[PDB]
Design a protein around this motif. Structure first.
Motif, PDB file in Angstrom:
ATOM      1  N   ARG A 112      -4.165  -3.445  -2.928  1.00  0.00           N
ATOM      2  CA  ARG A 112      -2.986  -4.009  -3.565  1.00  0.00           C
ATOM      3  C   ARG A 112      -3.093  -5.525  -3.631  1.00  0.00           C
ATOM      4  N   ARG A 113      -2.725  -6.084  -4.777  1.00  0.00           N
ATOM      5  CA  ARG A 113      -2.721  -7.524  -4.976  1.00  0.00           C
ATOM      6  C   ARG A 113      -1.303  -8.070  -4.869  1.00  0.00           C
ATOM      7  N   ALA A 114      -1.201  -9.399  -4.911  1.00  0.00           N
ATOM      8  CA  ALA A 114       0.079 -10.065  -4.705  1.00  0.00           C
ATOM      9  C   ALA A 114       1.085  -9.769  -5.807  1.00  0.00           C
ATOM     10  N   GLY A 155       1.433  -6.699  -7.333  1.00  0.00           N
ATOM     11  CA  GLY A 155       1.654  -5.274  -7.460  1.00  0.00           C
ATOM     12  C   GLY A 155       0.596  -4.517  -8.228  1.00  0.00           C
ATOM     13  N   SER A 156      -0.517  -5.152  -8.572  1.00  0.00           N
ATOM     14  CA  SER A 156      -1.601  -4.480  -9.268  1.00  0.00           C
ATOM     15  C   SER A 156      -2.637  -3.974  -8.268  1.00  0.00           C
ATOM     16  N   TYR A 157      -3.593  -3.194  -8.770  1.00  0.00           N
ATOM     17  CA  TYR A 157      -4.537  -2.496  -7.912  1.00  0.00           C
ATOM     18  C   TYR A 157      -5.933  -2.564  -8.513  1.00  0.00           C
ATOM     19  N   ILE A 158      -6.936  -2.470  -7.643  1.00  0.00           N
ATOM     20  CA  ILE A 158      -8.342  -2.493  -8.031  1.00  0.00           C
ATOM     21  C   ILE A 158      -9.061  -1.368  -7.299  1.00  0.00           C
TER      22      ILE A 158
END
Lengths: 113, 118, 125, 122, 214
Positions: free
Chosen positions: D70-72, D74-77
């Motif tokens: 999770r990124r700052a 709210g996205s994802y990798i």
RNA sequence: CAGGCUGAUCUUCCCCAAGAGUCCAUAUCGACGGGAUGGUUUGGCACCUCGAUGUCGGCUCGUCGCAUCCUGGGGCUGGAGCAGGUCCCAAGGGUUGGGCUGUUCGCCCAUUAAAGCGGCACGCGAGCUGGGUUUAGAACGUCGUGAGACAGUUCGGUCUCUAUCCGCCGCGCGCGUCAGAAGCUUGAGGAAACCUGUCCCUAGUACGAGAGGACCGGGACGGACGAACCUCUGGUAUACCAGUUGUCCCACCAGGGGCACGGCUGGAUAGCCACGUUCGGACAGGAUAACCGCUGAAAGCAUCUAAGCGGGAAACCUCUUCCAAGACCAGGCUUCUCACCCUCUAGGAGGGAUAAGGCCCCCCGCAGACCACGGGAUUGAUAGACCAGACCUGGAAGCCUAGUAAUAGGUGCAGGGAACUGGCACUAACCGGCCGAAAACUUAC
RNA sequence: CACGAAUGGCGUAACGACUUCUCAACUGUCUCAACCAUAGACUCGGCGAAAUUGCACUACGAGUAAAGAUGCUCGUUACGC
């Protein structure tokens, strides 16, 4: 009727196109690198969409240098400043998780005609 | 409708499904049957969703009733009599009456009846 | 861990000493007794500790008397690191651990010279 | 989600193919290692004519994980494979080429030399 | 001095910052409050204020309760609680008949939210206390989830009050500290607290000014 | 084997000071002699148990001591700085994962602020294992003429019990707190929690030939642990949706159903949950430990002390969270009901009927083993049905068209559907029973 | 310490629910646990045992004692079921 929908209304966004899983899109994202704002493009098939209103997300899948990458965003995220739908695909599923074990010519998706 | 909260009613998940279809078949044939109280309580939502199919009687609604009650003499009665009869009532087609306990094992029994007041 | 033997070198003269042990059964048999009642765990550890204490006391006496510069110790992994943990800080600082064979084989002067030359080279460097 | 006894691929040209994780640095009793987290590993596969030899003890960094992060915003990798890059004490790559994409989190952890050589920083 | 208000929990939602970050928030209906009683030192020996919140029909009020509301000239309310003040100087800030609203809190402030936790029923040692269990193979004998030894033999011979065992957990009173209020809605009377607050949706919470960082 | 007495041996210290330390006994070690604490080791005795107290190791769960491993506070140094040695105070919290061995112990690998030492029947088998070990099988080495033996080895070998009493974890019933009830609380007394690192600024500064490199003071981000919650990410889904294999049935086609782990596959809202999201350890004050001091005699000097006055730490007391008047000194601020008949021989007591209020019956809950708790009960949205929305699945049946057929397209964001939200008295909350209110007296004003 | 030649010595393709060491695939054995169903456990109606049993309105600490005390001493704590 989403008892809290009177709070989520203000934070919704307009001008999102109408896309479905199986469609090929490219997503323009904003990145920050030393306070210099630029834009990056992620192009790939849309493989799912988890509707919740303001908390709806979708997933895009790509192959990069022989390595696949999945990237998930919130639909109404201010970071996504632009979405372009490039193709409409033919799928019989609502979630395309079966693509995860397919590579190359086996991962192509038909298109509407 | 709403799934059972606790352990199922007949002993398993497949005996309860066949137990409810047999109870609704006997409710639509005689109009009043006497069962154990937890068996009548769980039958009210189940039997009422089949009358609604008969109210909006088409070929599509008929074939969704036929996949539960399986008795061809009761499907006719649902669409010829019990459907048109309740055409002026918005829900609440069933009534439950509590009666004396059973002698053998002290089970609480109750009577479930179709509404005929109109 | 049944004893030791020590050689002190002060140049022309060589002094030899054989330290003997007071705990005889230093081997712990597999048997314990009826249902494990009676067990030779502690009564053998104490014998080995007695032998180590005797050797350490003799070596400390030699260190206090002659003031050696190096104390080579040749043994095995078990009865060379537990004797090093018994010696005081006085002598444990000047201990070089060897890797030689059993005491029944015994060593000759040439073998000891070759064993210690590698350490003395670094010491003089 | 990389821990002890876990095998990763190597995305360098140092001659290594598989490494086994040994320890996760950054504190005692640490549990998992994500993108940009340094580990200690040992070489399990190698090319016959390379620098790193089978059985070495090396340090490495994680560039791809199968677990989503999770990124700052709210996205994802997410990737399909765990990969690692062998580094040295100054936190510089031992090799010269990097294969495949790497996560953006290496920019935050000041891996400036690895990011430059990476073909794509997603 | 210290600020407080009685409200109800509505749910969890999601808003974005002015720096494009996401922040999870909890929506609290900080409904209007009316002051019913003031606890002075001379009458009581301590300093506090009594706030009433809710809405109850006049048919649903017990007669002794309806007489206490009538003694203050205030319509009956469903819930009555208290807010404790640290001195007598803060007593002068309130009076009977006042009308507290959500606007008393400003954006960026820190608050303490007190509620009643969800009930978990009769719970075992793993759920209630986190006891690591015992092996599921290698020849276990029906002890896969149960605690084990509970003391030392023959000395003492008792089981040491405070031993952790099975029982009823949850449904207690919890106070979360140093939550940050994100946005106050005047036209809705709704606070957006950033974080998680105890209780189930529709339960009663108390939002009070933070005691540590405030 | 455990407990008990003793303390030769063991363990932790101490007295004297020959010496080592270049010079210098006492920065740091300290010989020959001597004096003790503790009850972890090897032993001595044979005091309870042989009509039975199951032995080592591992697991789960702990609690205590300080002779302190880390973090905290100091004195000396043969302490330039960083880093150390030794001693004094200090038990609040913390004290990793693997290779070999049945092994406790131990060596090694990779880290860490650290990978502390002991007691509790060498804690814990009516809590678990059974790897070691002495039941019965077999084999090796040695001993014996032999049956066999061995403080030498190897492969195997049933772990029984429905908790009566104390003890511990949760939950009710009865009575009391001087009339019967109902809201909101004070708190004597208890429980929980307390851990720590890296980087940046001061500063490449003080210190140092140089290499190196700070105290004090600010700021950023973490590791382990704990709690609450379900917006995001993931896990599950036995009355959800779709495909498909075998077989039987609904007369047949079409469409479906029963069984085969929900037959198997692809998803999956609500609920529960972590792998997920948020938050916490504090700031401040008081009395102190070692230690540092001010003024100052007995003793014309000197002395932190005998008179007086001060600084001083994660230990202690307040401070943070929770329980709490069965706290028998059974508390406080208020608001309700605040009045009726009969009998004994009218001293006192007994009985019935009530008020405020409560309980049972009924409809329910994300409250729950039962009980209890919370909500509703027609002056009614509590549960179900009905209508609509959100959400899941993924394009229903019928008909028409194209293809010889398998199949595809249109009607059509179709059909189906549970938990979430809003409307609607249509069904059920009923023409109902049981409990429940006051002897006075003394003194003061 | 304390092998040895029909109580045979040294090897041996095939074989072994025999013993020991290693590798690949696999996995809830584990990091580290989470959820669902059924049979008990729980509640209601019926029938209805057992081993055991000197007593009983059967607390804790520090001691004493046949040397490990619910029952003795001094204190602390504790409304009845």
């Amino acid at each position: 009727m989403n008892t809290l929908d009177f709070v989520d209304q203000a934070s919704l966004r307009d001008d999102i196109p109408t896309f479905s899983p199986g469609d090929t899109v490219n997503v323009h994202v904003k990145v920050i690198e030393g306070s210099k704002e630029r834009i990056q493009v992620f192009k790939g098939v849309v493989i799912r969409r988890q509707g919740g209103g303001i908390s709806e997300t979708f997933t895009v899948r790509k192959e990069s240098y022989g390595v696949g990458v999945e990237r998930t965003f919130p639909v109404h995220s201010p970071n996504i400043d632009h979405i372009d739908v490039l193709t409409r695909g033919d799928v019989r599923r609502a979630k395309l998780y079966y693509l995860r074990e397919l590579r190359g010519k086996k991962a192509k998706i038909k298109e509407k005609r | 409708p709403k799934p059972t909260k606790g352990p199922r009613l007949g002993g398993s998940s497949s005996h309860q499904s066949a137990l409810l279809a047999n109870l609704a078949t006997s409710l639509f044939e005689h109009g009043r049957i006497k069962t154990t109280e937890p068996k009548a309580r769980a039958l009210r939502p189940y039997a009422e969703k089949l009358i609604t199919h008969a109210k909006k009687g088409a070929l599509h609604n008929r074939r969704e009733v036929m996949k539960k009650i399986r008795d061809k003499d009761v499907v006719h009665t649902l669409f010829a009599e019990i459907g048109p009869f309740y055409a002026d009532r918005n829900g609440g087609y069933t009534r439950i009456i509590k009666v004396e306990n059973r002698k053998g094992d002290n089970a609480p029994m109750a009577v479930i009846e179709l509404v005929r007041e109109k | 861990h049944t004893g030791a033997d020590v050689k002190l070198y002060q140049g022309a003269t060589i002094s030899s000493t054989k330290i003997d042990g007071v705990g005889y059964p230093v081997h712990k048999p597999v048997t314990a007794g009826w249902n494990g009642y009676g067990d030779f765990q502690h009564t053998t550890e104490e014998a080995i500790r007695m032998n180590c204490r005797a050797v350490a006391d003799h070596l400390t006496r030699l260190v206090d008397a002659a003031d050696p510069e190096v104390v080579f110790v040749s043994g095995e992994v078990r009865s060379r690191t537990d004797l090093l943990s018994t010696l005081p800080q006085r002598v444990a600082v000047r201990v070089s651990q060897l890797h030689a064979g059993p005491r029944k084989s015994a060593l000759d002067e040439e073998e000891i010279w070759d064993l210690t030359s590698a350490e003395f080279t670094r010491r003089r460097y | 989600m990389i821990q002890q006894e876990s095998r990763l691929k190597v995305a360098d040209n140092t001659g290594a193919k598989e490494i086994l994780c040994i320890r996760v640095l950054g504190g005692s009793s640490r549990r998992y290692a994500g993108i940009g987290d340094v580990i200690v590993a040992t070489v399990k596969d190698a090319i016959p004519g390379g620098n790193v030899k089978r059985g070495d003890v090396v340090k490495a960094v994680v560039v791809r994980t199968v677990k989503e992060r999770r990124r700052a915003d709210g996205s994802y990798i997410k990737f399909d494979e765990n990969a690692a890059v062998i580094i040295k004490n100054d936190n510089d790559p031992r090799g010269t080429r990097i294969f495949g994409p790497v996560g953006r989190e290496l920019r935050e952890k000041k891996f400036m030399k690895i990011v430059s050589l990476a073909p794509e920083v997603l | 001095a210290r600020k407080g208000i009685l409200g109800t929990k509505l749910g969890m939602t999601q808003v974005f910052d002015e720096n494009n970050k996401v922040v999870p928030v909890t929506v609290v209906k900080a409904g209007p409050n009316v002051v019913t009683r003031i606890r002075t030192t001379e009458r009581d020996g301590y300093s506090a204020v009594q706030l009433a919140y809710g809405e109850i029909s006049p048919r649903k009020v017990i007669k002794p309760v309806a007489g206490q509301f009538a003694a203050a000239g205030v319509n009956p309310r469903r819930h009555v609680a208290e807010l404790r003040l640290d001195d007598e100087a803060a007593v002068a800030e309130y009076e009977v008949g006042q009308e507290l609203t959500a606007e008393i809190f400003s954006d960026g402030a820190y608050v303490d939210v007190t509620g009643t936790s969800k009930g978990k029923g009769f719970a075992g040692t793993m759920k209630r206390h986190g006891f690591r269990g015992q092996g599921a193979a290698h020849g276990a004998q029906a002890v896969h989830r149960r605690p084990g030894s509970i003391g030392g033999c023959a000395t003492p011979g008792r089981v040491f009050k405070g031993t952790r065992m099975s029982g009823r957990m949850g449904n207690d009173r919890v106070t979360t500290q140093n939550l940050k209020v994100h946005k106050v809605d005047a036209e809705n009377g709704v606070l957006l607290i950033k974080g998680a607050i105890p209780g189930r949706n529709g339960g009663l919470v108390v939002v009070r000014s933070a005691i540590k960082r405030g």
